[PDB]
Design a protein around this ligand. Structure first.
Ligand code: NI
Ligand code: NI
Ligand code: NI
Ligand code: NI
Lengths: 570, 122, 100, 570, 100, 100
């Protein structure tokens, strides 16, 4: 007996060779392989396969290879591939990717993916599943920003702040042992993974280091606290000792140095360069040249992404507003003009496409949008396909190479840079079960269900008073994973090794899962998945034109984007 | 009697900044091809290498401009600025690591500045 | 619908604007929150229409005049900021000194 | 180099001699002194002063005189003065008022106010900063009332109730050990300081005392539970032993006695007289005569504040509604007419202005408005300036004397009366860092940011999904200080010494900071800051006219108030 | 705007009133929540206009008649209470037996 | 009023519908959330009028046509579901393929 492919895809989601459009973009992903056995697909419901004696094993206890949760028929979009599989979860971790069911009666069942009495089922047929997004440029300014992030598929927030204090409104910094302790306690009630960055500023080691010992997971150097050669140097010394990452927003004003001076201070050590294009901040006009070096892990923030017709007008004015610049002060005008450059913003689109900028991030509530990292990543990939065409590396008319390059920018690459990729950042066995289900029509725009440590934390769902969950109004809502003490087991507070060794969690009464920051100092650009390119980036000091391999990187701004007015009420 | 909510009625007069401190005028030029903007409270001798001035005259001093403002030097621009004396303990640490102690150690600051190529030592 | 947090919140701006417009229509001088609500909603609705950021920066300064509002309201409003979804995605509009 | 004063005030906030209008009132406060050194003002941002090596010290660890938080350039409005200073916070307490920065390079830096690596910055230039309001007449009826209070700058709620039970709807009482224990546990999730009052009723000591031992912070005598000579007497005996305050709503009906009988029962002991004017309750018609005695700490509740054209019509009807009075029962009508008196309400405006009523409070949800204590205090001060003119004590055309008299009514004086002024109630060194920032245009109306124990708990802030925090809608929101376990460190549960000594917090698993109620029995009217006047108040039994020093206290009701329709959407 | 908790809540009364008025306009007898919403919003809007408390106590009794509402609704509503900002600050209005 | 959780939530559907209808009236092709909001509110308002479930299943398919909405919106909406209080209590209406 045979089933035609249209009907197969409707029933079980797509299989090998089938393509799926990402939202209303022109991007198509193709199923590269399928771990199923045709005829023995897992599914749940009345008269379906996952019933006792049948696709559900009725013999084995939970410890004997049985799953807590099976996501059936997922279309996985990950740096590791674009493919069809069941995903098995146990103890809050992904334990199996393959084929779940009952080996009593089914062929090809992955040994540790038995559906048994202990197994919950989530139907992922017809859904795309990705890792939770990892946003490493978060200002903790307003707790309402968390749901904003969850609703666009973000599951980890790395950054700093204490609320709407000026220091936090400008910089991702939680300064000193006490503020760090306070925010670690606050984090107990935030339904998302968190890591906190201390102030990467000082001329002695101890004031910087004591933040790491207090529980910071990294450091931020920001020009507003003095991004000087000394602060850069002491931060990187502390980071090399503590095994945490340092992020930098460099000296835009070129006050104590130019880019080359900052690079001299870094002295070959590993550093995460924030908003590398420079609209978000950094040595004017040539900060983006950072992205060519092997010791730099470069990220963009999202407001420049991608280059559109409103971008410049919006940013020039945004900058006048947030910096309290005056139109009547010519040095204010010059400063804005040296910082917001169409030449570098256009080039930034292309550098992403070429795998030279490795990461995206938000800059949430400081100069970026908490719920648009994922959104704007795909809008950029889509613009680049339109303007530059399918990449040379593409195969069956699919955009799989570009999709892996771009999905890596907000999942695995930020995790690697931050030293947390042993826990999060991809759909791989042995990692924490932070998973995002998307209807393809809403892909990158509005997440369907967000799973955190194996329990749904957030979902687009309807009327709680209704006979069924689909009646209006369908909106993003916090789910049982966020309620009571379950928020403790479904989320990770990432902390430094030294703070963990000195017993900070017990000292502060933290009940959340504690994740260890590690392996941050031994990496480089070469470790950024699909985005590992090093090259000489020249930025012309007079024209701001960006050159790579002798050629000017420019493109046009677009009047219209997908994943915009078709989807959003405002 | 039009009411502007929360408005100031400021007293008469002016506010003299950095009153009673020695002031010094020097010429400074941006020999680089990118803009340099310098804040009110950076130890002036520790500013960007490519600013050419008599570095010795920046020691123990900062710009005499309102707290929180900056002087801007476009690429190639040469202009005069007025400096005032640092106060408190007259010690500087970090920044460009040229001082790391008393600002009175002029010879030591200048030798470090010269070795690292901060323009205008001598 | 799949409303996200911002969409739910911004509905309340539209609602406050409708309240305020009803109040203006029966002859009242508008107060501070009402004035803000009207101009904000205008901006968001302008973005929905496909106007540019530069267009809304201009238009936003002529939605209300000082005779539409109470004494002191023009001086209370230094600027009004709103984000909405333009055809090219979310952008921030700031209208400076909207009521002169 | 010189800066003119308009430009100085725009940059750093006002300095000595400058005046600022409070919202849209006709009240002006004048800066009395400034702790800054002109030229070395602290400020934070790009190219600003608080950068490493400069205004931020890069040498010192947190324990070596470095602050957790610096509020820069605050205009302080407090009973201690109206002046310009930086405010330094550490371990959740105000540790320094003066001049913050780096003594490396700055003159005049207060020794314990070093901005270092551990320091967060809040820019208060152009803001007025006050102590958090202390509301000592709160009915705990609806938990939504907390945000209402925070949004008008209240940070401590003293009173009683168990929710919308009739006892609580009428009286600020949490009756008995069990209800008190329950509400102490509830308080663990309320983001505001709390103290709980037991029932000040009984004819034996033990039933009253066991409430104090259980964790009550004081007692309430209310006529609805029988405000008899016996209940008054036993409550004050318990209070003298326990060192807690007693509040009284006296016997309006004159059933067991007149005012003089209640005073005989009090017998010279210290007592807090609630809604002393009497519309809120008390011996008709002469309860307000309480406010003349040296052993009485007198407060008003807020609905009579100030006397307006709608006040009487509103109150007569409010009273008919809440007391279920019938228009057809002439004793009901007589009772209302004996209780709502224009003669005493008009006099109450004047007594506040003369420093004879020392305190304001809300009477939240029983006969008063949770979010309008601060609001109506300033509306009263403004009405009095209009009708009575500048006070004799005023100087440079400023209203500084009146402003200190009135700010004292909702900050320091309720704290003193309640025995908690060692922790809260003013901006002084060694006190808990409960601070309210106000834009002058919104002063008394809508708080900008509310700081609780050194972390922002509530703020007027905008779209959480935006690039920056200022886009609409700007509304009051709970901040990180209220989230997770941080709510425990940023708030105080005030309790009796005996309950603390008997280990009640540990018994109940309370994690909040525990504050000790003390020094309540040894004070009088003379201890009320700027409101310490004792005098013979005569209330005419036939006309209700109020006389002080031979003269009738009357004024007219006003048709219009400031801090009203210019600000509020409803 | 600087909306406080009450302002956010009371917007929802205005919204329910508009819903109810639309329902009355297409010929429906109003139910209990609809009737309450209409009269409440009227009071708050009356305060905004600068009417007195005494005026609204009178007017509130003639906003809806028994022929506007369903059987039993007049008897379900003993009174309607609302607070709003009058020119002289926040005051409580109670309308007794609004539909007779 | 005695609003329960669902009543508070469904007010926001009515509000989004009014927003969307204003947008249609100034000549805009409606997007996905707007289309959903309009049809949903129509259903709930139909229940309030006393129409049957079967009536609303029919009517709901003619509220908006493909020329009223953006490219792809008809295909994004497989069905719209709403519960409201009919004369015989709460019932679920599903409108299948409302825009064809
Ligand atoms: Ni930055
Ligand atoms: Ni940032
Ligand atoms: Ni009372
Ligand atoms: Ni009371």
């Amino acid at each position: 007996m045979k089933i035609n492919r249209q009907q197969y895809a409707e029933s079980y989601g797509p299989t090998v060779g089938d393509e799926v459009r990402l939202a209303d973009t022109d991007l198509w992903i193709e199923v590269e392989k399928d771990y199923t056995t045709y005829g023995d697909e897992v599914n749940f419901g009345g008269g379906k396969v996952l019933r006792e004696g049948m696709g559900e094993n009725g013999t084995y206890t939970r410890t004997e290879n049985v799953l807590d949760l099976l996501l059936t028929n997922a279309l996985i979009l990950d740096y590791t591939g674009i493919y069809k599989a069941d995903i098995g979860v146990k103890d809050g971790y992904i334990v199996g990717i393959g084929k779940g069911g009952n080996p009593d009666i089914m062929d090809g069942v992955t040994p540790n993916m038995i559906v048994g009495t202990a197994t919950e089922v989530i139907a992922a047929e017809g859904k795309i599943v990705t890792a939770g997004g990892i946003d490493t440029h978060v200002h903790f300014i307003n707790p309402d920003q968390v749901d904003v992030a969850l609703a666009n598929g973000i599951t980890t927030l790395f950054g700093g702040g204490t609320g709407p204090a000026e220091g936090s409104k400008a910089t991702t910094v939680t300064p000193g042992p006490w503020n760090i302790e306070k925010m670690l306690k606050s984090t107990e009630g935030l339904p998302i993974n968190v890591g906190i960055l201390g102030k990467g500023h000082g001329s002695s080691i101890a004031p910087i280091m004591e933040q790491i010992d207090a529980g910071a997971a990294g450091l931020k150097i920001h020009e507003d606290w003095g991004a000087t050669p000394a602060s850069i140097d002491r931060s990187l010394t502390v980071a090399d000792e503590a095994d945490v990452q340092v992020a930098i927003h460099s000296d835009t004003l070129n006050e104590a140095g130019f880019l080359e001076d900052t690079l001299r201070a870094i002295n070959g050590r590993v550093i995460h360069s924030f908003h590398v294009e420079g609209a978000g901040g950094g040595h004017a006009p040539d900060i983006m040249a950072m992205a060519g070096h092997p010791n730099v892990l470069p990220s963009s923030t999202n407001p420049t992404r991608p280059f559109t017709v409103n971008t410049i007008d919006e940013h020039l004015d945004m900058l006048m507003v947030c910096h309290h610049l005056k139109q009547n002060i010519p040095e204010d005008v010059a400063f804005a003009d040296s910082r917001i450059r169409p030449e570098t913003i256009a080039a930034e689109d292309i550098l992403h496409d070429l795998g030279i900028i490795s990461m995206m991030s938000t800059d949430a509530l400081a100069m970026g949008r908490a719920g648009e990292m994922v959104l704007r990543t795909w809008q950029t990939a889509d613009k680049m396909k339109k303007q530059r065409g399918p990449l040379a590396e593409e195969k069956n008319g699919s955009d799989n190479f570009r999709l892996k390059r771009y999905v890596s920018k907000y999942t695995i690459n930020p995790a690697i840079a931050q030293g947390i990729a042993h826990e999060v950042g991809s759909i791989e066995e042995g990692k924490f079960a932070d998973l995002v289900l998307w209807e393809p029509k809403f892909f990158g725009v509005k997440a369907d269900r967000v799973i955190k440590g194996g329990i749904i934390a957030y979902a687009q769902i309807g009327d709680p008073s209704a006979s069924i969950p689909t009646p209006q109004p369908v909106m993003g809502r916090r789910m049982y994973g966020t309620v009571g003490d379950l928020i403790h087991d479904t989320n990770i507070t990432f902390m430094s090794k030294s703070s963990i060794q000195q017993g900070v969690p017990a000292k502060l009464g933290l009940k959340r899962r504690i994740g260890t920051v590690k392996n941050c100092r031994n990496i480089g650009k070469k470790d950024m998945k699909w985005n590992d390119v090093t090259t000489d980036i020249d930025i012309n000091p007079e024209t701001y034109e960006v050159k790579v391999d002798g050629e000017v990187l420019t493109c046009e701004p677009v009047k219209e984007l997908p994943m915009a007015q078709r989807y959003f009420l405002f | 009697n039009y009411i502007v909510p929360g408005e100031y009625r400021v007293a008469e007069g002016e506010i003299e900044i950095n009153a009673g401190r020695e002031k010094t005028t020097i010429r400074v030029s941006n020999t680089g091809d990118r803009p340099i903007q310098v804040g009110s409270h950076i130890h002036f001798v520790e500013v960007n290498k490519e600013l050419l001035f008599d570095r010795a005259e920046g020691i123990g001093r900062r710009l005499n401009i309102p707290s929180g403002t900056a002087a801007r030097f476009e690429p190639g621009e040469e202009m005069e600025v007025e400096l005032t004396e640092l106060g408190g303990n007259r010690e500087v640490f970090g920044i460009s690591d040229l001082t790391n102690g008393s600002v009175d150690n002029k010879e030591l600051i200048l030798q470090r500045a010269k070795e690292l190529g901060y323009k205008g030592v001598e | 619908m799949h409303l996200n947090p911002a969409e739910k919140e911004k509905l309340q701006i539209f609602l406050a604007s409708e309240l305020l417009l009803r109040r203006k229509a029966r002859g009242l001088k508008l107060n501070y929150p009402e004035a803000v609500a009207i101009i904000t909603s205008f901006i968001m609705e302008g973005a929905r229409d496909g106007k540019t950021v530069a267009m809304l920066m201009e238009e936003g300064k002529h939605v209300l005049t000082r005779d539409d509002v109470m004494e002191g309201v023009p001086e209370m409003i230094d600027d009004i900021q709103a984000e909405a979804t333009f055809p090219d995605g979310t952008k921030l509009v700031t209208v400076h000194n909207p009521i002169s």
